[PDB]
């Protein structure tokens with residue numbers, strides 16, 4: 001299952017939306033990427049079953065920054081047309097988790113935390129119309145879940 | 157990992173929203189459950205990797221109806237306070253998929269199809285304010301992903 005094939009799925013998912021959704025989403029994510037990373041590790045480190053796989057040092061020195069870079073990569077893909085590069089990266093991230101047996105149910109819960117908080121931030125974005133915010137939230141759920149799908153290829 | 161423990165997670169997720177979000181979501185889902193099932197199997201049977209696991213007869217005679225019942229169960233849980241019953245059901249559904257080795261990445265893509273189409277339907281619901289529709293879409297993503305999390309427990 002090659003990256004140029006997986007890139008079609010990413011391109012097709014994003015093509016359901018306009019560049020306006022891509023930009024609105026990428027703007028809220030870049031403006032809040034540290035706060036989104038904070039919320040992700042706040043949610044995970046609180047569950048003892050998730051904390052099992054995480055050290056405070058690993059989060060502080062590596063993963064907190066990596067999560068910000070992951071978010072930027074996901075939301076840069078469609079605007080910069082870097083589909084093949086992004087899907088290739090998602091596949092490798094998935095392989096990292098599968099190799100150390102991160103329970104897939106915690107990966108999906110993590111994805112949900114990011115989708116929820118990004119869509120909460122979009123709802124409060126005064127620069128978007130009701131219709132534009134709505135379309136952007138649908139894109140955020142779609143593109144995040146596409147990234148999660150690529151990551152979850154490693155688990156089969 | 158008992159059902160009364162898993163029920164806390166479902167209750168907590170739904171408690172982030174008001175009964176207004178629960179009802180708006182349950183109303184759009186019940187009104188469109190057959191059309192949502194249609195869209196789910198339209199998306200899956202189109203991918204040859206997913207069609208591998210599905211016969212037209214299995215979809216026509218069992219799963220199409222089961223998907224409608226799954227949707228009704230997910231959106232009935234918070235309004236009827238049947239948390240323990242719903243999480244118990246989700247766990248068993250997950251076990252069905254894990255036993256016949258349904259790739260988890262296809263389960264997540266399926267969940268995304270339902271979230272996308274339900275939120276598309278909510279956007280067009282003239283009876284909801286912009287703010288109410290927004291809150292309801294966030295609930296739909298959260299509660300669907302909670303159901304998916306419960307299903308994915310079987311894969312670890």
Ligand code: HEM
Pocket residue numbers: 044049050051053054058062063066067070093096097100102106107108110111
């Ligand atoms: C949406 C969900 C997730 C995303 C986007 C994500 C992101 C990432 C990324 C980008 C890396 C690679 C870091 C690097 O090598 O630069 C990574 C690795 C890792 N992730 Fe996640 N992750 C997710 C879910 C989880 C969950 C649920 C856990 C644990 C409960 C977890 C624990 C880890 C661990 C332990 C590593 C390896 C760190 C190291 O030892 O190199 N991740 N993750």
Ligand code: HEM
Pocket residue numbers: 200205206207209210214218219222223226249252253256258262263264266267
């Ligand atoms: C959100 C995702 C999904 C939901 C909500 C869901 C729902 C269900 C439910 C409720 C059942 C139990 C039916 C019964 O015993 O009454 C079931 C079984 C089954 N599902 Fe799914 N499913 C999902 C994803 C998938 C995917 C991605 C595939 C395949 C590519 C798949 C294929 C099957 C098969 C083959 C069975 C067993 C049917 C039988 O032989 O008894 N499902 N699913």
Ligand SMILES: [C-]#N
Pocket residue numbers: 063067
């Ligand atoms: C992965 N943090």
Ligand SMILES: [C-]#N
Pocket residue numbers: 219223
């Ligand atoms: C499962 N259809």
